[PDB]
DNA sequence: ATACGGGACGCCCCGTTTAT
DNA sequence: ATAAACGGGGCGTCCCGTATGT
């Protein structure tokens, strides 16, 4: 209302120092006072405040899934889907800090089912992805579909990357078709990558 | 000292399982056996003891780069599976990703940006001697290899990652030829448990 | 109102964690919850959070009245009237949920006019006592306090109306002429929930 | 250290501030304000705010039994020590605002952590005791109900009152024994007690 | 009278120096 | 390595009035 209008405001301005400072060193009145509200604005939203942070995360698991649907039917090879989909997920990181700090609370545990634990979350999305990308021929039927996902997915978490960081997600890609993609594939991918970082 | 040692390993424990920025003095004093005054004593300030886990890391980190004696790409290849060997051997160097990973002060040099310009180093004396091609991209396999050792955990699946990686990085970086030791080399080193 | 149904049951609700919890150890959080009731709709019908400590107090005193001005409608006499009424006030207190809370209210900030519950009690009971010594049930010399200190804790220092006439029975023994103890003795006996 | 200086001066702060405003409702900023004393300080000696009032309980239901010790050595017996034993806890409310505290705590909420020293079944026993050593000494009648004599007289000795000027303390506590003999003590010996009483009021 | 927003503190306790 | 004291917020939440899109 002016509700989601303001319980928007906040976990914006909570997941930008979340991410800028981490869950711990983020005073709940540094937040409070840099999404212009109040304790008591901010109070009816979020009681505790890994009420932010779970609803920091619950946005992440959300709209990562909601970029996995964004491209399925929309005529995509197998790895194309997952490679594109991760330059989607670099998409946001870059413009907004949600993600960003979604991210970064992936080392809280401040994890409680239902909730998403975001990396089986990836882990699964991947191997399958992958282990479905091994069909369309396009990745090599000899390889340990399940290493690669456990790898992909820190190779995405980065350093500094735990940006710029599209830009880094290309060379990863880059550095991991060359050696995973068959010969001939290396084409449609590098350029994919390439062309993918540039406007993502 | 002896309680030097004491203060720290208890420190780092907290640390690595409940987190710097959460884990109280009182804890630490208490978990430890040490009285309060005990801890001020050793050390200034609460940081001071994450200071003192970095170091431990930061140290017996070119402690292990030492043993250089060897395949430019080997001991960068052997280099990483001790580190990870490493992360594992108690909680002190355990502790000190856990401080890296959050927001770490320093100063030390720095905590990824030393590890990331080490390899580096490796990688163009590896390109220096024919074992890695020469327009590979360093830098950008410096950082791949910099993060990708995190894995997704930041539980037996350790080298039984590394080993896979490792392939990868080989299989486009390395030549067709030399590629052949330094993958069964990725094998053995994995069969270090 | 007829919808004033809601106001009884928060105040209902509101006594009754009073007399447990406390007063601010209660909050408006738990009494709303409680209630079963909007803090919005506990708004309109009341100010603020001592209008139900005060909307409670009210209760209580409007029958201190409305059940001693009914005692003597009977043909009844002072000293009598007097304990009669020492135990109609112990034995609601023994049942109200509305007035455990009075109570626990008086103890531990009445608005006025409404006079402290205690002194009004105490000014009460001196009548009633003033009167029975016109009457010469009681002797003409002792200090008609005495009085209501005795008579509050026998529920605050927590079958117990057994406690309540076993002080009456000392307090007959020592005002009341020889002669005139049997009748309330008997009577303070009598006077167990029967 | 010195310590104690502080430490007691908090509760002294403390105890007059929990009689005269309630536990609840007085806050540990009025206290380390009374007290002039740093919230850090208080931390020192009391984590949470139940320690202080714990803290004021034990040290009252400790003062109380050390004058059952001290009104011994045959200085009477039953009524007449219960009477003074009384009378001095009167005399220290009138001054000790951590006595006054003390009965406070009792009647409003007296919160969690063992074991709390329940200050009321710990008087119904010293007092019945007490008194019932009196029927054994003929101060008072055989037919007297000494457990229900005893919930009255520690339910008098609360009153109520400040609900009325501190001070007029054991003035009330005169009366309210003056009532009681009569009621309970032999024709033959209320002298001895009357005089006790009314003389015994400005002297505790 | 609903939802939403508003401040105000209360308590806890934490990371530190003086008395030493 | 003391025991005592120190301030300084953190979080929670409480008791309330201005806008209110069910």
Sequence with gaps: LRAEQTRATIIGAAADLFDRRGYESTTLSEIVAHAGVTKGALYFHFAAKEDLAHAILE????????????????????????????????????????????????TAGVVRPPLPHPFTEWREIATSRLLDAVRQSDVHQDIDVDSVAHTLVCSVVGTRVVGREPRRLAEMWYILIRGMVPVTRRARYVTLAARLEQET
Excluded: N, W
């Design 59 to 106: 946005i992440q698991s959300r709209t990562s899934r909601r970029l996995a649907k964004d491209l399925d039917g929309r005529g995509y090879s197998s790895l194309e889907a997952l490679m594109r989909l991760t330059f989607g997920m670099a998409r946001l990181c870059v413009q907004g800090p949600v993600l960003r700090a979604g991210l970064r609370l992936a």
